[PDB]
Design a protein around this ligand. Structure first.
Ligand SMILES: Nc1ncnc2c1ncn2[C@@H]1O[C@H](COP(=O)(O)OP(=O)(O)NP(=O)(O)O)[C@@H](O)[C@H]1O
Ligand SMILES: [Mg+2]
Lengths: 572, 587
């Protein structure tokens, strides 16, 4: 319950819309209890008065009270639904800005342990569940409590004993029934969420491995094991519905017990008044209508265990230490970045093979240097050069200054990068390229879209076309021209290319390497790769084996001498 | 499309016949619960009249109290009973539909299952099928109780007063009139906002999966103002929808409030004498106004709960949209013959004009002509999309072909798939270990095998190399889609079970394609020495070492175009030599 403190502090921003929506759920629910207890009294008082007391009885005050308690019961429910859902969408916006701001500084490495897409589908869901804390927990529980304490205080003006036994029964089932049914359905809630995952993993293992199971003659043996998990999964859903059946039945008997007690006790007298005519129906009709406040309260405590559970997953993921910290130096961006590396760890050691002598490579201002690794390699330069994590050994310098000196405002400005996994954001093409340079005009976006070759994306209001999810998808070799377009729009002196040609057919990858030549002609291009198609134009080719540079030199210079690159160029 | 909506809800109401005695008991018990409501409201109305009008002491009313307590007990019993009967209705429908889904998905075989991601089938079998529970457990039982209970109320009030019953019944046509009148202004606010609320729905997860891109471009602080702006848009756009969906909910709470307020005024004023209609000239009694007042909130409760369970009809028509589409796919399966191959030795496979076709009917491999004698290790090479694996599947019986593919002189379609698959074993492109523990995966082929043959089986495949590296040894859990075994470790265990049993054929999709450098040597030489025991057909992307194999069978876009020993076409200048050049261009 203390896991919810970081997010209950997020409610302080909207504490007036959130508390208004709870007040409107009380006024609505007091006017429902007061419409049926004023009607019940009005019929008893009118019948007792009769035609004899047509003039003595004041019927226009109760008749104007059943009209008022019926308009606030009707309009109040409408406004309670509007305020409670508006105040819920404003907290949701806060919950998303909050979790996004915390998940950013720990973006590449803080989420590396979990599988992105399976972790980010829960993160979106656990934020959608902390949004439920107000509608599904706080409002039903708080609204029920101060409706019980307002009918108890009100009924105590007529009789203390009868107000306390009616309010005591209501209050004893506010504070005992919800927790006693959460403990009864805690064992089957753990079992239910376990058998569901067991069936899910056996179902995907049965579907993916269908080719092997049929040929090795075990498809129908792992099928009956899959049905037995469903049979156990359906028997844990039965026990859960056999408990909501008991919750609804017991809740009916308590609200029934509160009516026989109001009938039996209030006939003996309300207050000093013995044989009260119209005041019996005031109590029994209050008890008949008051247990509407307690209808949503047993399931409101059940959903508190899931808002708490999600409050832990969100809290642990966002309460992590960021890998890197950026000084607030405010250093102006400088052109002509020259990159120098000293004893830097190229790839993390495989099971700590040895003290990997770091690659001490120097790159001049305009040099296009290509790092030619073996399959697997695993250059982290794109990770260390963008400060995804601090290097444990060696030092990295950008323009004869340490890399840690640059603030994130300028570090992201002096390095342009194209990754292997280019992200197609769901937004429009204009918004999906202004990611690179926000200040660029629309005309400049259109030019670079032609100068890269993405002229097919400029058809029929192409710049306004929705891409990504729910929009037109770009295939391999279409994205790679979009990743480069961003790198050319967000022009930076130093350009890192992860593997600009991977999975591209020989006809289209030729255009990619030539595109580098004239577009990035004066840029400290540093392109690590595994292919050989156009390394001739790359100055100072580096051949790579397990973190130690074998040889360096221009393509013609390196090929002329017999070397590691020589065997690559001819054969294997 | 409401033309399909008629067919979808007809599908939903056709699948309900499985649990039909559960939806009948739930309809009978909704009629009993409407009778225990009226008895409950009749005993309270008669007890309250004695105490208030006739001033009868409570000790004389022990018979109506006993009956009143009894109805409350029976009323709770048929609420517990009706909740349980409702669950059984939806369970026996989900269970029977899921069996149908898993049967059409098992008969379709591995050829169709690969058309979709493995997590896109578990949505259909877990989420979609379980989304249909509350339509049968809660919505259908309530729509029965939403017409019986309100009509029992009126039929029981009409003998007492026809004006009290007319107040409740007069709102019966007015509620649908205004609810539809409002509801057709809420289909214009839910139309112009449908597209914009689908774009904004997934915007958070989109920005959240591209945080690495926003990091490297320095737009992390500029997407907070995008989440801020795409949440103000989402809120203001969905409050327009809700501002009208809460009027529809509020039409019923208006007539619930109006009717309770009209019963109170009509009865209160008629007791005084301001009103002189409604009764049958016998006079209006206090017990007849309590009965109409306890039953006025209860008249609208069935229609109020039905408004909460109505969403369950939307998420069950959603799940019927995809379950009906899946279950009516016209895909055609290969013919399971009755012929049997009892050779138990390398098969003399040969084919002419196969024209292999996918389950959907699309053709995958063109005219294929090859003759592979018994015991001849043969390989296939080519580029992606040439259907090299589509020929391996067609030999396993996973695909249907229009032509002759005679195995040991017997047509494959005429050969019974059950008996054909004891003479067959193969290694996949992606190792799939359907078992749980590593020992079981090796012994998947042979449920109980001699330990010496087992021992020799996994030692020969070089899986014992990393057995000491494992935590629990051989009997270790290989979790589903988990890295307890890496790609290297999990590929030699696929080979370990491929070679455990003697086979009359051995297919290889691409063993050691994504493998690590050391495992590639270990896995590939074990298969290479195992391709000399029986007729072997292999697909490979590493064209560098194939001199030992008998043929090459390089194919493009569905047809074998060159054949011959690796020496012959290594420098013949054909596409294979060009393809070999492409392999060497990378590293
Ligand atoms: N089950 C299937 N259903 C539909 N189309 C299929 C199926 N299997 C293959 N194809 C199509 O057949 C072509 C690829 O055949 P395939 O057998 O995958 O070739 P491959 O050489 O094994 N491919 P790869 O493993 O990527 O190098 C493409 O047009 C595929 O979309
Ligand atoms: Mg393949």
């Amino acid at each position: 319950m203390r896991a919810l403190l970081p997010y209950l502090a997020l409610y302080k921003r909207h504490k007036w819309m959130l508390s208004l929506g709870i007040v409107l759920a009380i006024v609505t629910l007091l006017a429902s209890i007061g419409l049926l207890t004023l009607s019940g009294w009005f019929l008893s008082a009118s019948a007792v008065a009769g035609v004899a007391g047509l003039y003595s009885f004041n019927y226009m005050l109760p008749a104007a009270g059943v009209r008022g308690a019926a308009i606030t019961r009707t309009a109040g429910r409408y406004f309670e639904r509007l305020v409670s859902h508006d105040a819920t969408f404003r907290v949701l916006q806060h919950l998303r800005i909050y979790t996004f701001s915390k998940l950013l500084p720990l973006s590449p490495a803080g989420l590396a342990r979990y599988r992105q897409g399976e972790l980010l589908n829960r993160v979106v869901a656990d934020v959608d569940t902390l949004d439920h804390l107000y509608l599904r927990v706080i409002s039903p529980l708080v609204g029920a409590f101060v409706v019980i304490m307002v009918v108890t205080i009100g009924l105590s003006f007529l009789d203390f004993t009868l107000a306390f036994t009616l309010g005591g029964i209501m209050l004893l089932t506010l504070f005992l029934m919800p927790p006693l049914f959460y403990r009864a359905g805690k064992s089957t809630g753990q079992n239910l969420t376990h058998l569901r995952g067991q069936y899910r993993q056996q179902l995907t293992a049965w579907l993916q491995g269908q080719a092997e199971l049929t040929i090795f003659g075990a498809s129908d043996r792992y099928r009956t094991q899959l049905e037995n998990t469903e049979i156990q999964w359906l028997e844990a859903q039965r026990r859960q519905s056999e408990l909501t059946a008991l919750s609804q039945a017991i809740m009916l008997l308590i609200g029934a017990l509160a009516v026989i007690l109001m009938l039996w006790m209030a006939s003996g007298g309300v207050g000093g008044n013995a044989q009260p005519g119209a005041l019996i129906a005031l109590f029994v009709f209050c008890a008949l209508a008051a247990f509407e406040a307690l209808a949503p309260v047993t399931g409101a405590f059940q959903h508190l265990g899931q808002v708490i559970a999600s409050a832990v997953r969100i809290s642990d993921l966002t309460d992590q230490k960021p890998e890197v910290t950026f000084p607030d130096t405010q250093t102006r961006v400088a052109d002509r970045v020259s990159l120098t590396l000293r004893d830097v760890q190229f790839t993390y050691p495989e099971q700590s093979q040895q003290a990997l002598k770091g690659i001490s490579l120097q790159v001049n201002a305009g040099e296009h240097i290509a790092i030619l690794g073996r399959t697997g390699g695993k250059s982290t330069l794109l990770q260390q050069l963008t400060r995804a994590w601090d290097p444990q050994q060696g030092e990295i310098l950008l323009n004869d200054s340490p890399i840690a000196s640059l603030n994130e405002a300028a570090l992201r400005q002096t390095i342009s990068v194209v990754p292997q996994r280019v992200h197609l954001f769901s937004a429009t093409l204009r918004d999906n390229l202004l990611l690179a340079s926000p200040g660029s005009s629309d005309e400049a976006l259109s030019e670079i879209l032609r100068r890269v070759g993405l002229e097919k994306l400029l058809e029929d209001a192409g710049l306004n076309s929705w891409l990504g999810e729910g929009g037109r998808q770009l295939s391999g070799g279409e994205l790679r021209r979009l990743a480069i377009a961003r790198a050319l729009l967000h022009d930076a002196p130093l350009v890192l290319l992860d593997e600009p040609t991977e999975g591209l057919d020989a006809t289209t990858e030729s255009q990619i390497l030539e595109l580098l030549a004239e577009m990035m002609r004066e840029k400290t291009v540093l392109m690590v790769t595994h292919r050989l198609r156009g390394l001739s134009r790359f100055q100072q080719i580096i051949v790579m084996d397990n973190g130690q540079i074998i040889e360096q030199g221009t393509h013609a210079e390196l090929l002329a001498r017999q070397g590691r690159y020589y065997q690559f160029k001819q054969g294997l | 499309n409401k033309s399909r909506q008629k067919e979808l809800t007809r599908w939903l109401k056709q699948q309900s016949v499985i649990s039909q005695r559960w939806l009948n008991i739930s309809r009978l018990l909704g009629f009993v619960s409407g009778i225990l409501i009226i008895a409950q409201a009749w005993f309270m109305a008669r007890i309250l009249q004695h105490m208030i009008m006739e001033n009868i002491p409570r000790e004389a009313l022990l018979l109506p109290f006993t009956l009143l307590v009894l109805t409350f007990v029976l009323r709770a019993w048929v609420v517990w009973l009706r909740e349980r009967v409702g669950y059984h209705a939806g369970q026996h429908i989900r269970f029977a539909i899921r069996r149908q889904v898993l049967d059409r998905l098992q008969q379709a075989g591995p050829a169709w299952i690969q058309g979709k991601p493995a997590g896109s089938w578990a949505t259909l079998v877990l989420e979609q099928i379980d989304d249909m529970h509350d339509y049968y457990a809660r919505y259908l039982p309530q729509m029965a109780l939403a017409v019986s209970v309100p009509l029992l109320i009126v039929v029981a009030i009409f003998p007492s007063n026809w004006a009290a019953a007319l107040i409740l019944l007069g709102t019966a046509p007015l509620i649908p009139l205004f609810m539809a009148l409002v509801g057709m202004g809420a289909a214009d606010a839910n139309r112009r906002n449908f597209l914009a609320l689908a774009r904004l729905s997934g915007h958070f997860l989109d920005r959240l999966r591209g945080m690495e891109t926003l990091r490297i471009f320095g737009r992390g602080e500029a997407e907070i103002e995008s989440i801020r702006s795409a949440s103000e848009d989402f809120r203001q756009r969905t409050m327009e929808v809700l501002r009208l969906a809460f009027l529809s909910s509020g039409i019923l709470e208006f007539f619930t409030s109006l009717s309770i307020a009209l019963v109170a005024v009509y009865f209160g004023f008629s007791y005084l004498g301001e009103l002189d209609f409604g009764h049958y000239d016998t006079g209006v009694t206090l017990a007849a106004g309590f009965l109409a007042l306890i039953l006025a909130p209860e008249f609208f409760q069935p229609l109020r709960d039905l408004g909460t369970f109505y969403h369950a009809k939307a998420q069950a028509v959603g799940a019927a949209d995809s379950l009906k589409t899946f279950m009516e796919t016209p895909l055609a399966h290969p013919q399971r013959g009755e012929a049997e191959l009892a050779s138990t030795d390398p098969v003399t496979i040969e084919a002419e004009e196969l024209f292999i076709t996918s389950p959907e009917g699309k053709t995958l491999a063109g005219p294929l002509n090859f003759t592979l004698p018994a015991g001849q290790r043969a390989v296939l090479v080519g580029r992606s999309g040439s259907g090299k694996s589509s020929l391996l599947n067609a030999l396993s019986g996973f695909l249907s072909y229009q032509g002759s593919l005679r195995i040991n002189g017997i047509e494959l379609r005429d050969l019974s798939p059950e008996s054909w698959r004891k003479h067959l074993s193969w290694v996949g492109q992606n190792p799939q270990l359907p078992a749980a523990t590593l020992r079981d995966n090796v012994l998947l082929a042979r449920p109980d095998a001699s330990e010496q043959e087992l021992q020799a089986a996994l030692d020969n495949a070089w899986v014992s190399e990393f057995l000491p590296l494992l935590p629990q040894g051989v009997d270790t859990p290989v979790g589903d889609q988990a890295a307890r075994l890496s790609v290297g470790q999990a590929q030699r265990v696929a080979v370990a079970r491929a070679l455990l049993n003697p086979c009359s054929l051995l297919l290889l999709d691409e063993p050691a394609a994504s493998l690590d450098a050391h495992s590639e040597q270990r896995v590939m030489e074990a298969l290479n020495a195992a391709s000399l025991r029986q007729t072997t057909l292999m697909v490979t992307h590493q064209l560098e070492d194939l001199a030992d194999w008998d043929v090459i069978w390089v194919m493009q876009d569905g047809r074998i175009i060159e054949q011959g020993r690796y020496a012959e076409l290594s420098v013949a200048g054909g596409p294979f030599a060009t393809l070999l050049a492409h392999r060497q261009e990378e590293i």
